[PDB]
Amino acid sequence: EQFRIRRDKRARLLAQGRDPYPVAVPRTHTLAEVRAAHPDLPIDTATEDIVGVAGRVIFARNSGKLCFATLQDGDGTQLQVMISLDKVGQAALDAWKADVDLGDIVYVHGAVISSRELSVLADCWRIAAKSLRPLPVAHKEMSEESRVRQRYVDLIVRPEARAVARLRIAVVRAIRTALQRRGFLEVETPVLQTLAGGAAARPFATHSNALDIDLYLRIAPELFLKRCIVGGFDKVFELNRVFRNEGADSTHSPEFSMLETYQTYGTYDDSAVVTRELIQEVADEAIGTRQLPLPDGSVYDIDGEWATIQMYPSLSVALGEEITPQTTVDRLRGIADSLGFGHGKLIEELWERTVGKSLSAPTFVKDFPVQTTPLTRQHRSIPGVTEKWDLYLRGIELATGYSELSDPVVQRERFADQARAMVLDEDFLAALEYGMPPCTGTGMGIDRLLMSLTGLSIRETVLFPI
Amino acid sequence: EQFRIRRDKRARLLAQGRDPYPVAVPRTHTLAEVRAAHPDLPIDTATEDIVGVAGRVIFARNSGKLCFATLQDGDGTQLQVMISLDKVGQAALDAWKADVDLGDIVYVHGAVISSRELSVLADCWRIAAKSLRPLPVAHKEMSEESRVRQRYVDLIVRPEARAVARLRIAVVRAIRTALQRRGFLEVETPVLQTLAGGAAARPFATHSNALDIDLYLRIAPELFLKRCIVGGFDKVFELNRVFRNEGADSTHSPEFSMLETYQTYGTYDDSAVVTRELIQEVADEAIGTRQLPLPDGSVYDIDGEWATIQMYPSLSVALGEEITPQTTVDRLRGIADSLGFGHGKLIEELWERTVGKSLSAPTFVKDFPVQTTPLTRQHRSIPGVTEKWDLYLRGIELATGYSELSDPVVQRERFADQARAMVLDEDFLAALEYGMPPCTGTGMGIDRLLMSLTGLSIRETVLFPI
Numbered sequence: 056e057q058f059r060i061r062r063d064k065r066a067r068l069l070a071q072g073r074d075p076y077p078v079a080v081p082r083t084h085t086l087a088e089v090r091a092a093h094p095d096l097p098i099d100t101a102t103e104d105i106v107g108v109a110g111r112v113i114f115a116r117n118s119g120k121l122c123f124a125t126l127q128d129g130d131g132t133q134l135q136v137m138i139s140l141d142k143v144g145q146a147a148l149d150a151w152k153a154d155v156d157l158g159d160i161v162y163v164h165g166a167v168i169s170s171r172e173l174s175v176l177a178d179c180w181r182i183a184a185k186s187l188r189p190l191p192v193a194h195k196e197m198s199e200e201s202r203v204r205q206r207y208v209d210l211i212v213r214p215e216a217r218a219v220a221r222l223r224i225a226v227v228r229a230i231r232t233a234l235q236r237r238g239f240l241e242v243e244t245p246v247l248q249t250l251a252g253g254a255a256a257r258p259f260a261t262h263s264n265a266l267d268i269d270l271y272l273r274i275a276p277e278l279f280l281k282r283c284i285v286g287g288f289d290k291v292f293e294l295n296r297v298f299r300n301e302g303a304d305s306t307h308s309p310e311f312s313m314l315e316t317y318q319t320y321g322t323y324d325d326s327a328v329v330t331r332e333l334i335q336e337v338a339d340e341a342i343g344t345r346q347l348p349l350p351d352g353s354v355y356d357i358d359g360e361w362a363t364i365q366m367y368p369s370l371s372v373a374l375g376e377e378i379t380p381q382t383t384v385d386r387l388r389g390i391a392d393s394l395g396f397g398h399g400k401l402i403e404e405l406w407e408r409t410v411g412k413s414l415s416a417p418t419f420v421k422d423f424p425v426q427t428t429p430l431t432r433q434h435r436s437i438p439g440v441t442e443k444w445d446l447y448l449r450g451i452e453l454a455t456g457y458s459e460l461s462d463p464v465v466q467r468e469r470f471a472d473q474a475r476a477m478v479l480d481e482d483f484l485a486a487l488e489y490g491m492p493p494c495t496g497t498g499m500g501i502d503r504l505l506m507s508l509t510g511l512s513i514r515e516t517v518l519f520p521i
Numbered sequence: 522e523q524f525r526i527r528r529d530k531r532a533r534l535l536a537q538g539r540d541p542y543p544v545a546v547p548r549t550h551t552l553a554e555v556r557a558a559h560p561d562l563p564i565d566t567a568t569e570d571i572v573g574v575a576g577r578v579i580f581a582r583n584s585g586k587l588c589f590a591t592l593q594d595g596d597g598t599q600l601q602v603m604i605s606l607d608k609v610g611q612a613a614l615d616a617w618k619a620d621v622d623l624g625d626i627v628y629v630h631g632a633v634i635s636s637r638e639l640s641v642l643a644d645c646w647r648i649a650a651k652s653l654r655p656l657p658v659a660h661k662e663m664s665e666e667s668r669v670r671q672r673y674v675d676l677i678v679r680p681e682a683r684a685v686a687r688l689r690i691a692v693v694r695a696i697r698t699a700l701q702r703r704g705f706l707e708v709e710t711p712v713l714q715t716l717a718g719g720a721a722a723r724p725f726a727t728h729s730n731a732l733d734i735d736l737y738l739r740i741a742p743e744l745f746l747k748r749c750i751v752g753g754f755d756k757v758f759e760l761n762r763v764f765r766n767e768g769a770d771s772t773h774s775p776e777f778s779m780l781e782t783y784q785t786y787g788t789y790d791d792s793a794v795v796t797r798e799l800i801q802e803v804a805d806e807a808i809g810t811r812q813l814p815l816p817d818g819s820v821y822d823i824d825g826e827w828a829t830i831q832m833y834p835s836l837s838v839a840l841g842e843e844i845t846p847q848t849t850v851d852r853l854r855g856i857a858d859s860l861g862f863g864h865g866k867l868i869e870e871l872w873e874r875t876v877g878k879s880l881s882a883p884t885f886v887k888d889f890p891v892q893t894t895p896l897t898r899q900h901r902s903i904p905g906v907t908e909k910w911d912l913y914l915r916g917i918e919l920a921t922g923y924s925e926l927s928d929p930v931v932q933r934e935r936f937a938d939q940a941r942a943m944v945l946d947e948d949f950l951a952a953l954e955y956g957m958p959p960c961t962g963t964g965m966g967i968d969r970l971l972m973s974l975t976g977l978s979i980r981e982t983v984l985f986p987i
């Protein structure tokens with residue numbers, strides 16, 4: 056309803072030649088600056104340093120001859136103004152009262168004081184924008200699901216949304232910084248693709264009008280990233296969105312930000328080292344500690360070196376017998392049944408369902424079954440496994456790395472099989488037959504990263520989801 | 522055919538327990554380093570500093586007891602190796618000859634010399650990858666259109682592709698740097714959207730399985746970016762892809778990288794200043810001069826201040842009469858006819874077809890007809906025009922800025938009209954009614970940027986197009 060009483064305040068301000076949506080107002084300082092300038096000014100004393108400030112009016116104590124308002128800027132830094140009868144504008148006080156509701160953006164200019172709390176005594180004052188929707192109190196405890204459909208109000212009423220948003224951006228800057236120190240180069244590769252590949256997932260397709268063909272949004276950059284290595288890039292990354300056309304859950308969203316990373320002349324040994332350094336480095340730049348605090352109240356130490364275990368062995372110890380690349384599916388399905396399609400899937404599942412689940416501290420698992428890794432090189436010695444690792448951080452499948460399958464005729468097979476469950480990406484292959492040097496790739500969910508570091512849910516790490 | 526003679530060299534190397542696709546090789550240095558280490562080593566003299574280098578074998582002069590090869594790394598830095606009978610491996614020379622074709626990646630380790638040109642005399646040597654497709658000579662002048670379908674070979678054979686790729690990335694780093702100095706913050710906003718808006722264009726749609734609705738790839742971030750400003754961001758950007766579902770040409774591609782930028786408490790006056798500083802700053806970091814050289818041989822000075830002209834006036838002078846917001850379409854269509862749907866479109870077209878075309882040096886045009894600018898504020902004084910500018914750099918429509926339409930009921934109209942040519946983005950509106958402060962937005966084609974700076978075509982600025 057009060058939506059109505061508001062629309063009229065605008066209407067009636069238009070009529071008078073008052074401006075409820077100016078083009079400019081001369082804000083000199085943000086409130087953070089007003090504060091940083093004057094840390095310990097003796098309270099109830101005046102300094103004559105003039106400023107033009109603006110921001111959001113949340114507190115309001117309409118008080119006869121003299122009003123009081125909390126200005127909060129968009130960062131959340133709070134200042135109070137004192138709208139007075141005396142130091143100009145009687146009718147200012149009349150307009151002020153009658154015109155200024157809550158959530159309204161409001162410039163005021165004058166001299167900076169403190170009082171019985173830091174405030175500015177206004178020579179001038181003006182509206183800068185006029186809300187026609189009052190801010191929910193916040194208790195009115197906006198549900199998680201309505202905070203996401205209206206993030207802009209969450210950002211205004213809920214301090215933590217401010218922190219999180221800012222954090223995600225700190226993390227991302229930290230990551231670009233980390234990889235640029237190491238001489239990596241950020242490339243842009245296509246989001247629309249004639250056949251999407253680089254991972255196992257159902258793409259989004261869409262129709263073109265230029266070409267009159269369908270096109271596929273990228274599930275992953277890997278394949279084009281590899282073309283760059285062929286093309287002579289030594290070290291490259293890309294940080295940007297992928298799209299996988301499937302259902303949501305606490306570690307899954309259909310569109311999400313994803314880091315991938317190639318570095319020529321190293322192996323999954325080398326790329327797990329970098330990976331861990333990247334994450335330790337990130338956490339510092341952006342959280343300021345490697346003892347990460349969680350809601351819980353507990354602390355998750357990500358400091359020092361991290362364990363590495365092997366899939367087959369580490370599984371073997373857990374099921375109380377030797378499992379190898381050799382173990383038949385009938386055998387495995389039995390064991391599957393004993394607990395609750397084919398070999399590789401059974402290994403990873405049994406692993407995940409016994410070992411993986413039961414990890415706590417940070418762990419790489421490595422040496423994976425070939426069947427489920429059609430892009431990663433075969434292990435250098437151990438037969439039947441590929442040079443790949445997952446990284447499980449606080450229980451979350453954060454990241455993965457490979458010694459990369461650079462051999463074209465092998466690679467042709469890997470896909471020829473896959474299919475049987477039939478056109479492959481024939482240019483991709485062609486590019487390997489030009490000659491891709493020894494490289495190791497990785498990738499990492501920025502969202503899982505934030506979760507694994509903070510405990511936050513996936514629908515809090517992203518600014519705008521649905 | 523020689524595709525055949527190659528596949529067998531691999532096959533027969535597998536059999537012998539030679540490795541044509543190792544996991545690792547101990548490259549210590551890139552060739553750039555070998556060079557930077559030893560600038561002026563007296564030619565034909567040996568220094569005993571050991572190195573492990575690798576890279577691409579392009580020159581090959583099989584020479585009896587002693588061979589000669591040009592190694593080129595992926596950056597293009599060239600070194601020569603000397604595969605000798607004497608300092609190890611007779612059979613090395615036999616394998617070397619029989620096994621090493623052109624384009625093949627090849628590690629060699631030893632002591633660094635110069636000779637009758639900088640080279641390394643190999644203690645060890647090994648293959649690291651084996652091409653099953655020989656590199657076109659380059660003349661064989663790969664057509665523009667086949668260089669794009671096979672960029673990875675262009676990157677290898679054509680030095681300029683190396684420069685361009687590297688340049689695009691220098692530009693982008695320069696831009697992020699420029700905006701981070703100014704206290705801007707890079708946000709990520711959704712690429713999938715329930716209704717795409719922020720610009721005039723036909724979206725790409727795609728079907729979801731989670732929701733079973735269609736979704737729209739973003740034509741533009743503007744609308745979500747504006748929600749962030751509401752939400753209290755002071756200064757934000759985003760640099761990332763948009764998708765517009767239409768035909769290609771020399772300034773148009775359906776997917777392309779695009780910068781947008783909001784800054785609260787300034788106007789299109791303020792955002793053209795920043796815009797020009799950004800571009801001057803970019804050109805320096807990344808081209809090293811503001812006198813930009815073009816194929817031509819000519820130079821395009823982007824230094825010093827830049828002209829600003831108004832649409833209506835500047836048009837008026839060109840057609841030899843007063844044109845204003847007032848001039849009817851019948852009048853305008855006549856003038857259209859005299860040369861070769863409605864008001865605003867006629868203005869911009871006549872303008873573009875008289876004034877715009879005939880510019881050379883860098884120019885902002887400003888004060889646009891309202892009809893074609895449904896998101897930008899109405900001018901502060903001049904009635905019938907909006908506070909917006911285009912930037913024409915070397916004849917190219919590079920960029921645009923607005924004093925932003927922050928008024929919700931006005932804004933509702935703007936769209937209600939549009940439609941008549943009927944569901945609007947009702948959340949977007951809602952967000953304005955929460956109160957968006959005075960801000961000014963811009964945006965800029967990274968691709969047009971590169972073109973306008975270099976003369977290069979759009980299908981050369983992007984790593985992978987089609």
Ligand SMILES: CCOc1nc(N)nc2c1C(=O)N(C1CCCCC1)C2
Binds near residue numbers: 307308309452
């Ligand atoms: C925020 C949701 O992240 C993801 N969503 C989906 N839908 N699928 C995946 C992730 C994610 O982070 N994944 C990868 C990231 C690369 C390494 C392995 C996990 C898969």
Ligand SMILES: CCOc1nc(N)nc2c1C(=O)N(C1CCCCC1)C2
Binds near residue numbers: 921
């Ligand atoms: C590389 C192609 O760039 C573009 N392609 C299409 N298809 N449409 C546009 C551009 C481009 O740069 N545009 C804008 C950029 C923002 C300011 C105005 C021009 C429109």
Ligand SMILES: N[C@@H](CCCC[NH3+])C(=O)O
Binds near residue numbers: 499
């Ligand atoms: N494409 C992989 C990430 C990179 C792994 C190493 N090449 C994935 O989607 O999981």
Ligand SMILES: N[C@@H](CCCC[NH3+])C(=O)O
Binds near residue numbers: 965
């Ligand atoms: N959305 C605009 C770019 C930003 C203009 C200022 N808000 C466009 O697509 O041209």
